[PDB]
């Protein structure tokens, strides 16, 4: 029941965690997947036959973002059950804490792709509850291993907060995050308020106004302000310490940025 590798597009990937693929498939230790419809197969011969006839060239759902070669597709788990189940089983090979794979109907899946000389390739995704009463704007979030640590994850995170902004909600990723996902959110949260603070020249700020603009949860903002040693306390008032050390170090960084004007989507 342990899968060791998968064949995905032009990549062969070592898998990290158990995923409940049907035991008829799991016991072979290796899976061959169509990179477009996410069907999993037993042999590369079967895969080759499938790609020769597979009609899919991109995720289902509606393309709700496009800038250059980057797309985001909104996939309703109730309307594309099989695709989303295959997506969740694939994700479980690389996420330890994901627990839902088959009951995809409560979820929306936001799938990010890159178009290139071969095709329109899966970069990663995040799932999202259609009704989160705990204000999670992300359930699970992942980049494929061949695109990790290359700025794509930051785009995915930014897109999740872009949706929250349009919804006029504040949100947070559901916990526990993967190791890399927590590392990525902390770095993204730091960059976000450095841009806010660089673009802001009032002299007093509430957590609320930062949260309202960025859609970042107040808890995440304060812990980031403490992580950056910018949250100080003198007499009876809490202060924010503008380290231009950081706004300049951040200013030296720059494409892999989401363009809000390229979003065609309403709640």
């Amino acid at each position: 029941s342990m899968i060791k590798t998968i064949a995905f597009g032009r990549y062969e990937l070592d898998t990290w965690y158990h995923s409940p693929y049907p035991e008829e498939y799991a016991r072979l230790g290796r899976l061959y997947m169509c990179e477009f419809c996410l069907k999993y197969m037993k042999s590369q011969t079967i895969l080759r036959r499938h790609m020769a006839k597979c009609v899919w060239k991109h995720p289902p759902g509606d393309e709700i973002y496009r800038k250059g070669s980057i797309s985001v597709f909104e996939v309703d788990g109730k309307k594309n059950k099989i695709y989303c189940q295959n997506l969740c089983l694939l994700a479980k090979l690389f996420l330890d804490h994901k627990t839902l794979y088959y009951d995809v109907e409560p979820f929306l899946f936001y799938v990010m792709t890159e178009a290139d000389n071969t095709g329109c390739h899966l970069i990663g995704y995040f799932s999202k509850e259609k009704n989160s009463f705990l204000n999670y704007n992300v359930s699970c979030i992942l980049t494929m291993p061949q695109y990790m640590r290359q700025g794509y994850g930051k785009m995915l995170i930014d897109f999740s907060y872009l949706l929250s902004k349009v919804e006029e909600k504040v949100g947070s990723p559901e916990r526990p995050l993967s190791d890399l996902g927590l590392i990525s959110y902390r770095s993204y949260w730091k960059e976000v308020l450095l841009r806010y603070l660089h673009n802001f020249q009032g002299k007093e700020i509430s957590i609320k106004e930062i949260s309202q603009e960025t859609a970042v949860n107040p808890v995440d903002i304060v812990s980031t302000l403490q992580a950056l040693q910018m949250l100080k306390y003198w007499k009876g008032k809490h202060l924010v310490l503008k380290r231009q050390d950081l706004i300049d170090e951040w200013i030296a960084k720059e494409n892999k940025t989401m363009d809000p004007s390229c979003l065609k989507w309403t709640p």
Partner: peptide, 20 residues
């Protein structure tokens, strides 16, 4: 609408003066 962080609690609505 408050945050507990260490060892006191903040209000989301209080203006925090920015300094150097």
């Amino acid at each position: 609408g408050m945050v507990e962080i260490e060892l006191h609690r903040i209000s989301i609505f209080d203006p925090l003066e920015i300094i150097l």
